[PDB]
Amino acid sequence: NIKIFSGSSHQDLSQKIADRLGLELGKVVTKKFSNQETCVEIGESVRGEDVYIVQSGCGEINDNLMELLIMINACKIASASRVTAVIPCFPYARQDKKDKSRAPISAKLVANMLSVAGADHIITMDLHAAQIQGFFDIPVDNLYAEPAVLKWIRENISEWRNCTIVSPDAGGAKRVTSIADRLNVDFALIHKERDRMVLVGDVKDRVAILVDDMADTCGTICHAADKLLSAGATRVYAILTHGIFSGPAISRINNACFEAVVVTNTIPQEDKMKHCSKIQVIDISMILAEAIRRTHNGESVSYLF
Amino acid sequence: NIKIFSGSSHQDLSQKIADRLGLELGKVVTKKFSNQETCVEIGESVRGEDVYIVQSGCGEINDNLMELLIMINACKIASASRVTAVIPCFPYARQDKKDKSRAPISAKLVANMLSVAGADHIITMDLHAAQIQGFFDIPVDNLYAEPAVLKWIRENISEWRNCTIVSPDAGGAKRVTSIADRLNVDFALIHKEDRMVLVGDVKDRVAILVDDMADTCGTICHAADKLLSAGATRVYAILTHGIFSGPAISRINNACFEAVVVTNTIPQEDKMKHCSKIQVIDISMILAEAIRRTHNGESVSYLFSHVP
Amino acid sequence: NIKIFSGSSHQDLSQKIADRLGLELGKVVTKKFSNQETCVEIGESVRGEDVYIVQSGCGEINDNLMELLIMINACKIASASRVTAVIPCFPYARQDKKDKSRAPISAKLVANMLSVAGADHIITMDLHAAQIQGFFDIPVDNLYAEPAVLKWIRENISEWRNCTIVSPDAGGAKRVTSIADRLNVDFALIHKERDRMVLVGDVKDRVAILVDDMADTCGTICHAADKLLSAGATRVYAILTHGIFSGPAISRINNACFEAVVVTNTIPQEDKMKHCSKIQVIDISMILAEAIRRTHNGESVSYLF
Amino acid sequence: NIKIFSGSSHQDLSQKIADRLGLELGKVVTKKFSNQETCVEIGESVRGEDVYIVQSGCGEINDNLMELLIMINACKIASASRVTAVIPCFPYARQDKKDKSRAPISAKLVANMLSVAGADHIITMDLHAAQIQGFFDIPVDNLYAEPAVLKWIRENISEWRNCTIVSPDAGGAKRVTSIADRLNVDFALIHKEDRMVLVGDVKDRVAILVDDMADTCGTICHAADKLLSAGATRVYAILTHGIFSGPAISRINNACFEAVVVTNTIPQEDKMKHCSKIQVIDISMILAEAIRRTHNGESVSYLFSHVP
Amino acid sequence: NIKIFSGSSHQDLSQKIADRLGLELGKVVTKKFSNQETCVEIGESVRGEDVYIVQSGCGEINDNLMELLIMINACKIASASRVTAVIPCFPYARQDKKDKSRAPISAKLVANMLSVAGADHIITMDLHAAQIQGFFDIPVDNLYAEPAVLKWIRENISEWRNCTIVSPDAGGAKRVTSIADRLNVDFALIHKERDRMVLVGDVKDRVAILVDDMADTCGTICHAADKLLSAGATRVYAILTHGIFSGPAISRINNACFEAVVVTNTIPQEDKMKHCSKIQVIDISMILAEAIRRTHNGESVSYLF
Amino acid sequence: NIKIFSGSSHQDLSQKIADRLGLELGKVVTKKFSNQETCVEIGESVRGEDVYIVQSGCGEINDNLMELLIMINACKIASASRVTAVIPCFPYARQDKKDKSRAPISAKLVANMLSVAGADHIITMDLHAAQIQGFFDIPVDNLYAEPAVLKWIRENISEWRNCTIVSPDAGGAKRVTSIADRLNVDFALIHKEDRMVLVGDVKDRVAILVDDMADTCGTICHAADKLLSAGATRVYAILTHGIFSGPAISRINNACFEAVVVTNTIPQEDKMKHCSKIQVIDISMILAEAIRRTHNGESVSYLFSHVP
């Protein structure tokens, strides 16, 4: 009655999820045409079934989005009973406001494409902005890596009782104060004179944990680390839920005084972990598997929060 | 071929806007029942016209919202060419996320209600969260009171070049860092844990609490004490939307504020009578200009950093 | 699997319905903000459930409507399987046509808001105009108080065999002729020179029963009564399904020669019944409970007609 | 930049309207199959233009409806700037409620079909029930034949100042009381139980049966007898829509009517040949005016109580 | 739980389908008003049921379409759980493109009307163009008569091993090459100088089987037959899935050298078969019944392909 | 009040179109990330304007599609009066049916994406299947390269009056019979079973393979051999959309083609450098004209059989 499919080369996360649920990934034929034009073909019947498609992790964001939309469309017209998009890292989530410009609100375009593609429900983790849930009319379940992060902080950082949760920018305030409140420690924030960086909050003679929802080139995260050192920080960690490590990223964190860099399984990290030793990954496949099972059985998903 | 109508008897703001455009407000016959069931009738033809309806300032948010929706409906089925909702202070804006609870995203519901009611365009000031524009599919022009605030500051605070812009909560960091950078001064943030914590330099400086709105004012009043305790010379509070419900007025009269500044996105006259610490910045010209430019198809972005 | 929630202070009707169904009302947190801004929070999971929200009866029509829409939205995004709005007295139902004016068709605005809020089905009683069912694309079940009214007329009025069903205005013709046909008696109608009132039909030397779907200030209903007396009516009753008694209402019916005024439970009457003795209420909670149960079990609801 | 097209060969009404606007009807190539499958082709460009399609009077309601929908579709995908459906007599209008049965609300389905077909505006005359405007989300202008009826009455019935306007059923009370009040005379109502009952004064007065439409005329014919039996001097019947299907014509030729008056919202020529009691009120000018004003963005409400 | 209704006078196909499923056709009241205005009334409850309405076969295409839409609407607002339109011969399917004219895409108008009427799923046979499935957003299952046609060709035509599948026009190329490939024979195509007819492909001294999705007046089909004869064809058959035989049709095929004309049950043929002997019908009721049963039980429908 | 913008740096076609209209391309600030996440910013106001966005020729179809959708979104929420998507070569057009498989109808998904993105009108050239217009509800103008092809033929092939127009597959019969009839010559069709079969007269005649698009060219290359083997004098291949991915170029350089002709609906410069058998027909004037007429509300059908 339940069916789980995956997209593109990536299958690590999808395979983990399927295993935890005691299922095999559904059969899906995929042939890439001329100019990356995506071809997808559901290798089995999904008629009357509760379908879950897990987003691929093949870097190319536009090929991934299209493959996901095409799969959703194929299942829908193949009379699937319900289609849910499991998207650990919501694409274009950062493009969620005009920001004083003649810019697109791409995250809303995406929510609309997903909806028109035929998605009936969304399962994602740590939306860049909680307001994005409102970009849909269909139900969205936004999971959190926070519990896992807190737990990891307590078990791997000895001086955590007196550490400081630091935000790379002004926009991450709420995220770090929330984590800082749970741990009962101090918080601090860095801001790039929008240039030089300014820091508010107490980090002197104590471990500084940089927390952010995501990191790409890691330019910011690496500069914030140097700043924290100059501020007299003991050791600076960097915890991200989504590790879009790209470009300089790999070399940057190595050449950075990061004691360690923790990221989740929301994006493939096997390739980068090899060329970067200070990187550790928190597996969130169990959380995702549990939300699917609970969504299917109609049980509480908020429990995982 | 422009037509401007006002929500209810609170013509106040809507009449200033109309004056600035060289127009009179459109005729609207409004009958109301005991259960507050709103009756509306457009007293003039709006056929083929560019209509603007400015939300009333009554105070009762559900009556005002329904009256706005009803007027939009009436104009749309009366063949208005276009209907724009001018909503200075967006209703339910603070209810824009589930926040880890089985809560409604009321701001999204409101956007959908305005949409199905027949709204073709929205004009508002300082949405509680910029992401709210994404709750609509129709175009939204979110005007800023910033230019007017930066001007009030430069013109009313002698020490502005050495002041600190303070956010009353963590969520406002971006807004204050933004004003601090334009002015080239320090910024600071207050985070409520039931204890307030302050990060940022305010010692021997004038502290300016800046936020989008103030309701019961319990937060800004407490932040002010915190700031003085931290060595601030004097404290100001500048919010774009002055709700001031409940004990706010009494709370402000007893607070150590040098002054509390708000725009007139919400009627402030009654409140001022009982509170002298309040000063109002008029934003009718900014709204009047967005409407005029919207109608003429001219740039409205000019208003984001320019006081007409 | 089934869940029933109620809104605002009112809970009399909702509690009766829940009891008849052997259920407790679902947990819903409610805190009213500054200017009556409505805050609602579903106190329990409704994921995969058949949900029924019963409209509150706290007079303020706009606060009631909003609270209902907000509750519907919260349940919908909380992954409820289906949401049904049980609205005994459909708000703005009288505003269902332009009527030769540049007026809104508010009843349609409401149907649209309800639909966009996420309602999948509507259960109401005695719609002001049957055409309102067409203002929705979703299924609407319009229940009738008629059977109960007829029954009440037979058991409480001795001279009913030869009474006259009277309509307060020209617009209630169909309503009274239908009831008059079932009882096999005469019908009459009153009209305000649209002023003085005119009456057509035979009421001389016989009990006159004024029937209408609703009454607010009761100005009309009270004038029609005086008229009926001058016409030589024996005794004049007034039967309404929706008793929006407001303003003068209470005092008016007392100072009116009404033998009795019968209304249904669709709107709270406990407060007004105290200051008005000639008022009797027909409880329709059983009818509503039965339509919900039948809607849930997929059984015939028309049976209740 | 206005374009008017006719449903089918029943140019009749559509040609009068066109004449009154100083226009010719647009070219339309129409091919039809044996199974009545309608083929349509807009013989001229409608790109960027204000299009009006007037429903044909063929008689076969489903063929006419489909032909109308098809033409609307063709114009819309051919980039017409706006497409208005001019439907004098709204199809399935009598099917506007479930009426306690597991019935379809066909009038709502029709409104949805016209909407999805691409209609941006509707112009009709005397909807069977005003609530029908609410079946659409697009604007609807529901014109009244009342002004024309009140004029025919004042001009054709000597005793109009002492006549009685009678409704053939309970549902028409509002419509007759409305005409009775404007004229300042009595009104009466007939209710069918299989026996008719009459309430209202008709004794020694001219009785005018007024309704929105007459089909088989079984009702108005029986009401007329009832009225004469009640002491009416003579009986008239004035309906806006003259369907006259089945035995209607034979039924009218044998009825005690002084005359039967209808508008030309439906072709009446063939019917008149076999029935001399029929007289037609031309409403083309009223429709032509609503179109002209719709196009110019001018008040159409003027027509509700004024015969152009 | 499952309910099958039929429309208008036609009930042959609908009755066959119901029998194969072991059911009686649902009760539906139908009274035709003045000018063919369609009146429909569901004679039984369909609340919470999986409903299937089979299109009538009463020639008048517009009365049939409307009756179908009206039935769909009535079931939908009567709280039916799901409504599926079973339409063997999709109306206006040939009007599926502008074709270099200011023409309507009627097939899309129809798909939209069906959708707005409330249809949740479509079951049809041999769509004039497969692209029409894309005119809907709802699931469409397009069945094929091909298997049955091939089978019939093998059992009724002795020289089939060396016959030629002929297309009446250029537009039927794909249809005939597909059938010709399955049988492993030659294909040919005829074209009207768009006049005289041209023929490409080898038909000399061999049976010619004209294949087309539909035939109305049969003008084309009959001319193609004469052409095939002049080309030196042994015997010319004509196989159509949809036999819209109208106008001259009946007389035309008789006066035509057609060895035989095969058509399916998608349209009533009992009346025409009497006045035309060379006509044979392949019953597709079992195929339709099987798709309904499979759609209801959530089993594979593609199996029938 | 017309505004034309280009998808990406592949201004090529979009710049020619702009030149032909006497305009410059609108300013667009485009930032792109490593994961190819597209960032766009309209560098000028489009408020109340008629906007045209011409899809880029980058090559990566998903990046180009997303960039197009994003730009449409940005313009729409920036209050453009109308936004038209000029898509010379429609993405996923070949994926327009299930074809007896549990496949997606990607061309329909793309139409829906463009619709919800906010597209009000589509302008494309030679949709793979005319039925694709029906995948939208908004108007679509599907331009033909035929007039330009018929002209290239008459002007470049001496024997055109005695040539044969050949379809590389069964599905193209209609398209070739159509060109064959206008020219008044023979036609032929090739059907791939893994063996090609040819029906039609090509003996001693110049054979012109005509199709809407050519990708890997495996088919046209094989069809050419087949044609020469059948007695064709020489073979040509004329496709409107020149994809030429994979081994196409190498495949064409080794094929027995006299020449391979394509339009510039897709950039062809890089391909031409490595392939001299390729010749390009410029269709910018045809696209420029459709835009100009679309904007002025003038007939665009004129272009279906007339080379501007």
From Swiss-Prot, chains A, C, E:
Q: What does this protein do?
A: Catalyzes the synthesis of phosphoribosylpyrophosphate (PRPP) that is essential for nucleotide synthesis.
Molecular function terms, GO-annotated: ATP binding; identical protein binding; kinase activity; magnesium ion binding; protein homodimerization activity; ribose phosphate diphosphokinase activity
Group of enzyme by EC? transferase
Q: Which reaction does it catalyse?
A: D-ribose 5-phosphate + ATP = 5-phospho-alpha-D-ribose 1-diphosphate + AMP + H(+)
* Residues that coordinate or bind ATP: R94, Q95, D96, K97, K98, D99, H128
The record's keywords, sorted A to Z, are:
ATP-binding, Charcot-Marie-Tooth disease, Deafness, Disease variant, Gout, Intellectual disability, Kinase, Magnesium, Metal-binding, Neurodegeneration, Neuropathy, Non-syndromic deafness, Nucleotide biosynthesis, Nucleotide-binding, Retinitis pigmentosa, Transferase
What is the activity regulation comment for this entry?
A: Activated by magnesium and inorganic phosphate. Inhibited by ADP and GDP.
Cofactor(s) the record lists? Mg(2+)
What is the protein name stated in its UniProt record?
Answer: Ribose-phosphate pyrophosphokinase 1
- Species for this entry: Homo sapiens (Human)
Establish whether keyword rRNA-binding is in the entry.
no
Q: Which family does it belong to?
A: Belongs to the ribose-phosphate pyrophosphokinase family.
The record's region (Binding of phosphoribosylpyrophosphate) falls at 204-219
Gene Ontology terms: cellular component: cytoplasm; cytosol; ribose phosphate diphosphokinase complex
What PANTHER family does the annotation carry?
RIBOSE-PHOSPHATE DIPHOSPHOKINASE FAMILY MEMBER, RIBOSE-PHOSPHATE PYROPHOSPHOKINASE 1
Q: What is the effect of changing H191Q?
A: In PRPS1 superactivity; no effect on Km; resistant to inhibition by ADP and GDP
* InterPro entries in alphabetical order: PRib_PP_synth_CS, Pribosyltran_N, PRibTrfase_dom, PRTase-like, Rib-P_diPkinase, Rib-P_diPkinase_bac
Q: Which disease is it linked to?
A: Phosphoribosyl pyrophosphate synthetase I deficiency is a rare condition caused by mutations in PRPS1 that lead to variable disease phenotypes including optic atrophy, retinitis pigmentosa, ataxia, peripheral neuropathy and hearing loss. Phosphoribosylpyrophosphate synthetase superactivity: Familial disorder characterized by excessive purine production, gout and uric acid urolithiasis.
- Does the keyword Protein transport feature in the UniProt annotation? no
Annotated effect of mutating Y144F: No effect on catalytic activity
Assembly, per entry: Homodimer. The active form is probably a hexamer composed of 3 homodimers.
Q: Which GO terms describe its biological process?
A: 5-phosphoribose 1-diphosphate biosynthetic process; hypoxanthine biosynthetic process; nervous system development; purine nucleobase metabolic process; purine nucleotide biosynthetic process; pyrimidine nucleotide biosynthetic process; ribonucleoside monophosphate biosynthetic process; urate biosynthetic process
Indicate which residues the UniProt annotation says bind Mg(2+). D126, H128, D137, D141
Q: Which residues form the signal peptide?
A: none
Q: Which gene encodes it?
A: PRPS1
Enzyme Commission designation: 2.7.6.1
Q: Result of mutating A188V?
A: In PRPS1 superactivity; no effect on Km; resistant to inhibition by ADP and GDP
UniProt pathway: Metabolic intermediate biosynthesis; 5-phospho-alpha-D-ribose 1-diphosphate biosynthesis; 5-phospho-alpha-D-ribose 1-diphosphate from D-ribose 5-phosphate (route I): step 1/1
